[PDB]
Each structure stands twice: as structure tokens, then as C-alpha cells.
């Protein structure tokens with residue numbers, strides 16, 4: 001029993017974190033095989049013009065107490081790839097994957113190439129992440145683990161004026177309409193991840209919290225008309241299908257759980273909590289709920 | 299900016315997790331140097347749990363009855379001893395991945411990271427706090443026994459908890475790494491219930507200072523209070539008493555934000571009376587008590603927004 005915001009074990013990623021220094025800027029790099037990946041703003045913009053002026057020895061890469069030798073450099077979108085003379089002996093089995101808004105991942109926050117903490121978060125529908133990052137955190141990475149393979153999905157680049165964070169996949173493509181430069185950029189209006197709130201309501205039922213259940217059902221169209229009014233993302237048939245296993249386990253149809261959610265939006269919690277929360281939680285996917293209520297190991 | 303429930307990186311602990319098997323029971327062990335630490339109830343059957351005589355059950359076992367598996371490698375047990383509610387299995391191989399470590403016993407209100415494990419394989423990491431009633435609100439399924447709680451301030455792992463059991467309310471009970479239980483619990487299937495839980499007042503105050511550091515001041519007021527008047531009001535909402543030690547510990551956060559501890563106590567009193575009125579504090583609609591003053595200083599910026 002119990003339900004916590006759980007991150008993947010970070011060990012396989014900790015063994016890849018390095019410190020990258022260029023001039024006065026120090027940030028984090030990800031060392032996989034003989035390449036160190038880091039945000040291209042470490043050279044700071046006309047990034048090709050700034051990069052052409054740099055030589056290999058201008059990039060100082062430190063792995064623990066060992067200085068790595070940079071033997072080449074190239075840029076891929078907003079990510080700088082530093083070829084080093086030593087392959088990381090701790091390189092895990094890995095993939096670079098681009099995630100969708102609503103999907104969750106673990107973040108290993110780092111400063112000076114040293115991991116300081118791990119937390120779980122979700123890619124918001126406005127493509128920002130509500131992270132916890134201070135100056136020096138750039139280059140910290142987001143990941144998921146499937147079996148023994150680490151899927152790297154995020155690299156931290158910047159903090160927006162509202163305190164939320166923006167970054168790229170490991171191929172340097174930003175999530176959201178953001179650019180790596182000091183300009184007037186703002187996070188768009190955010191919405192609630194509906195399929196994740198539904199998954200969290202199923203987790204609450206599995207853990208013995210059923211006060212919000214009712215005898216009613218709804219159509220997908222009527223639910224979406226209600227959901228649009230409360231700044232909730234539309235629920236698609238794909239979301240209904242994905243919630244199938246949780247529906248079969250608890251005996252509560254997806255549209256029956258939607259009728260519970262509709263009543264919670266229209267009337268509130270009335271002084272009650274669900275899984276120790278007074279707000280509807282949207283940072284657990286249906287897969288996260290099934291995994292945490294089954295004990296899958298890595 | 300931002301404020302998350304943050305756990306320590308778990309790598310140094312993952313390299314210590316092993317699977318311990320005795321008869322039909324399989325649970326987790328912590329392999330440090332040449333010793334595997336695990337809950338002594340691994341030697342029990344479910345029938346034995348009502349009134350187990352661990353000394354009588356242990357004397358009947360030999361080294362080769364304990365199967366220890368580290369990854370895909372079987373370790374050889376060359377000795378065994380019991381220390382309180384933990385079993386210490388001497389093995390013939392020292393763990394090459396043994397980090398710099400200490401065994402520390404924590405007090406209620408202290409936080410720590412938990413690496414939940416099944417069959418010696420880590421599945422997840424989360425942050426939690428030792429409740430005032432000595433239980434932890436964890437997330438554990440069957441097979442999680444032996445999973446450990448820890449802190450990693452600098453490069454040294456301080457092990458503070460080993461998971462032993464789940465109480466009827468769904469909360470969890472366990473021991474320090476010397477086998478002494480936190481709370482009035484026993485590793486026995488008997489009528490045991492968690493005592494009435496309370497809110498960790500000093501942690502809620504630390505979290506209110508974190509909110510001010512991050513730029514939010516809506517909950518502040520023009521009042522102050524005495525420590526005694528604050529405690530009289532706090533006890534009525536099931537909040538732990540705030541001691542002079544707690545006031546002293548909050549000193550640095552008070553100096554950084556410019557808000558006296560008893561001035562922040564007056565804001566908390568008002569929050570308890572009024573509720574949040576549709577507002578949130580650091581993205582939460584409830585008063586959060588699982589961040590210590592030390593956690594806030596470690597996570598938050600040194601410059602107040």
C-alpha cells in the first residue's frame with residue numbers, strides 16, 4: 001500500500017554526469033561512449049559563428065577527479081557534442097527518445113557535474129516542466145528506464161520568468177516554442193493532463209479511497225465539453241483504450257470514472273483528500289500507476 | 299526556482315542491494331563490505347509470525363540455508379548473527395561497490411530517501427519523513443522488506459531505515475541498521491496499530507520559509523505570537539509542539555527572509571484558521587510537512603526572490 005511520486009533509480013545516469021567548462025560558463029554534460037552532450041549555450045547568438053572560433057582545448061571536461069581530453073566538436077540543433085579520447089566505461093544500454101506532453105520522466109538535477117537530487121515530473125501540455133533547478137543546473141537530464149535500457153528524453157537549458165523550465169530532447173530539438181537565448185519568452189497557458197488525473201483516481205481506488213465514486217456514467221463528448229471548461233486536455237479514444245487495464249482491475253469503466261471527475265470539477269473535494277492531496281494530481285501516467293501498483297524492477 | 303520533493307541520487311545504494319532467500323521467503327538485503335544486513339523475519343514462516351522465538355529459529359539454521367544473490371552471482375555465506383531485529387550474514391566477498399557509509403538513527407520529523415526493491419532489484423526512489431508516530435507513509439508491496447532509507451549529504455551514505463512491515467492502516471514500520479525499531483512496534487503478527495499521527499510543525503514552518511524565498515508572501519500577516527500561545531493553538535489542529543530547539547533551527551531561514559520565527563508562527567496560526575481560500579503555496583493546497591529546515595536550505599536558492 002501507499003502511493004508516492006516515484007522516480008526511476010538514477011545510478012545508470014549518475015555514472016554519465018560530467019562537468020563542462022568553456023570560458024566563464026560551467027554546466028553539466030552527459031558522457032556516453034566517447035561523446036559528451038551538453039547545451040550549446042555553454043559557448044555563450046550566432047552559434048555557428050561562436051563555435052568556429054573555438055578549439056578543442058577551450059572545452060574543459062571533468063569526470064569526477066579526471067580531466068577528459070576533447071578531440072573534436074560538433075553541433076546538432078541546440079546540443080553541442082564533444083568528442084573525447086576516452087569512452088565512458090560506465091555507459092549503460094541507452095536510447096535517445098522524444099516524449100509527448102503528458103508523459104512523465106525522472107530528472108537527475110546536477111551542479112558542477114555532481115548529481116544532487118532526483119525527482120519525477122511530467123512534460124506539461126505547454127511543453128514546460130515544473131522542475132526544481134538553480135543556476136548551474138543546465139545540462140541536467142530527464143530519463144525513463146525500460147528493463148536495462150535508459151531512454152534519455154530531456155536536457156535542461158533554461159528557466160522561464162514564471163519559474164518553470166524549458167529544454168530539449170538529446171538530439172537538441174526544444175520541447176515547445178522556445179529558443180536558447182535571452183529574449184522575451186513566456187510559457188503558454190497550461191492545461192491539466194486528463195488521462196493522468198484519471199489514472200491517479202484509479203490508483204486511489206486500488207489503495208482503498210472510493211468516496212468520489214458514483215453510480216453515473218457520461219459520454220466522451222459530454223465529458224470533453226466539461227473538461228474544456230476547466231482547462232483540462234481533451235480525452236481521446238486512445239486515452240480510454242490505454243485506461244482499459246485499470247478499468248478491468250477496479251471494475252470501474254473509464255466513462256464511469258469520467259463521471260466521478262466531472263463531479264469533482266463541478267463541486268470540489270468538500271474538505272476531503274484523495275491519496276493525501278486536496279488537488280487533482282496529473283503527473284502519474286496510466287503506465288506509472290500500473291508499474292507502482294505491481295513492483296516492476298530495474 | 300521551483301520546489302519539488304527531491305530524493306538523493308540512489309546509485310550508491312543500488313550497488314548494495316542483494317536478494318536474500320531462506321526457505322520459501324525471499325526479501326532484500328544490504329551488502330556493505332563482507333556483510334549482508336536484512337530483516338530477521340526472513341527466517342520465519344507466516345505461522346511463526348504470531349509469536350516467533352527468533353533465537354530458537356536461528357539456532358536451527360546453518361550458513362548454507364541462506365541463499366544470497368547479487369545480480370547474477372551467488373554469494374557464499376560464511377557466518378551469521380542477529381543484532382536486535384536485523385540478521386547479519388557474513389559473506390566471502392566484500393562488495394567492491396561499497397560506498398563511504400555510516401549507520402545513523404533518526405528522530406521523527408527527519409526526512410530520507412527510500413530505494414524500494416523487490417528480489418534484490420531496485421524499482422524506484424522516493425522521498426519521505428519519519429512521522430511523529432514513528433511510522434512512514436511509504437509505497438511498498440509484498441517483497442519490499444529489506445528496502446532501505448538513506449541520506450547522502452556530500453559523498454557519504456547515511457543508512458537510517460530498513461523496511462520490515464506494513465501496519466493495518468497501510469503505513470510502514472521498520473528499524474535503524476542496528477535492528478532497533480522506530481516506534482513501539484515488534485516484528486510479530488500481533489495487534490499493532492499506528493498511534494494518532496500529528497503534523498510536523500517545524501517542517502511546515504520551513505516549507506513556508508521556502509515559499510517566501512521563492513517569491514510568495516500572500517499568507518503573511520502583521521502579527522506575532524508567543525511560543526506558548528502558538529503551541530496552544532497548534533495542539534488543537536493535531537500539530538506537534540514547537541520547541542525552542544525548533545525555533546533555533548529555523549534561525550538561518552528567519553535571517554535570510556527577514557521574517558522572525560514567531561512572526562511565521564502567527565502566519566501558520568492564521569492559515570490553520572482560514573484555510574487557503576482557493577490559493578496554493580508552492581503548488582500545494584495542503585500545508586506540507588515532509589521538508590526539514592535542512593532540506594529547504596539545501597534545495598532553495600540562497601538569494602530570496
Ligand SMILES: CN(C)c1ccc2cncc(NC(=O)Cc3cccc(Cl)c3)c2c1
Nearest residue numbers: 041133134135137157158159180181182299
Ligand atoms: C541565474 N539564475 C538566477 C537562474 C536560476 C535558476 C535557473 C534554473 N535553470 C536554468 C537557469 N539558467 C538559465 O536560464 C540561463 C539561460 C539564459 C538564457 C538562455 C538560456 Cl538557453 C539559458 C537558471 C538561472
Ligand SMILES: CN(C)c1ccc2cncc(NC(=O)Cc3cccc(Cl)c3)c2c1
Nearest residue numbers: 001339438439440442462463464485486487
Ligand atoms: C502481503 N502483502 C499484501 C503485503 C503488502 C504490502 C507490504 C508492504 N511492506 C511490507 C509487507 N510485508 C509484511 O508486512 C510482512 C510481515 C508481516 C508481519 C510482521 C512482519 Cl515483521 C512482516 C507487505 C505485505
Ligand SMILES: [Cl-]
Nearest residue numbers: 403404405408
Ligand atoms: Cl535526526
